[PDB]
Amino acid sequence: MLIVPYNLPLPGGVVPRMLITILGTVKPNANRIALDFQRGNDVAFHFNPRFNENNRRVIVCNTKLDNNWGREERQSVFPFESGKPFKIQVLVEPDHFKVAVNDAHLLQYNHRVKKLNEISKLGISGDIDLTSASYTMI
């Protein structure tokens, strides 16, 4: 269905009540997935499942400003599985991005980049077969 890396334009940026839905399948022996919500060259929200970081599975979230990564945010819960279909839902809330995988809440990421309506691209990359990527307002 879609070629990765995939660019989803976010016209006029993001805003509370915007829900982004990504459907795909993790490839066999995947190493990484990444969602990059971009404000120009900056990455407002990087969401990065790592399947083998020192033989552990962890999701790393961060922000990139002026080509410099900030302080990462990690939590322990890893709902992805190599070879299996997934759904990622990213709901923009007034103070954070809220992420659910396979209909279960995963994490929140507080807004570091304040100019939400300039976060105008979502890049989708890594070791997936990407089926679809879209948004709606709830």
Domain boundaries, the chain: 1-138
Which one-letter amino acid corresponds to residue 42? D
Strands of the 96-101 sheet, one edge to the other: 104-110, 96-101, 85-92, 18-26, 128-137
Residue with tokens 């945010």: 73
Beta bridge partners of 61: 47, 73
Question: Which residue type occupies 128?
Answer: I
Which one, of 45, 49, 69, lies nearest residue 58 by Cα?
A: 49
Contacts of 68 (CB under 8 A, 6+ apart): none
User: Residue ranges for the binding site?
Assistant: 69-75
Instruction: Round to whole Å and give the CA distance between 102 and 122.
Output: 20
Task: Give the residue among 95, 100, 99 at the shortest CA–CA distance from 46.
Answer: 99
- Is the separation of the CB atoms in 87 and 71 below 8 Å? no
Angstrom CA distances, 133 to 3, 9, 57, 70, 92, stand at: 11, 10, 24, 27, 15
CATH 2.40.160.60 fits 1-138, yes or no: no
Task: Specify binding-site residues for a beta-D-galactoside.
Answer: 69-75
- Beta-bridge mates of residue 126: 33
What is the resolution of the experimental data for this entry, in Å?
Answer: 1.1
Give the number of C-alpha atoms closer than 13 A to the C-alpha of residue 56, restricted to the C-beta side.
8
136 and 22 Cβ atoms separated by less than 8 Å: no
- Report how this structure was experimentally obtained: X-ray
* 8 A C-beta contact, residue 124 and residue 37: no
CA distance 72 to 61: 6
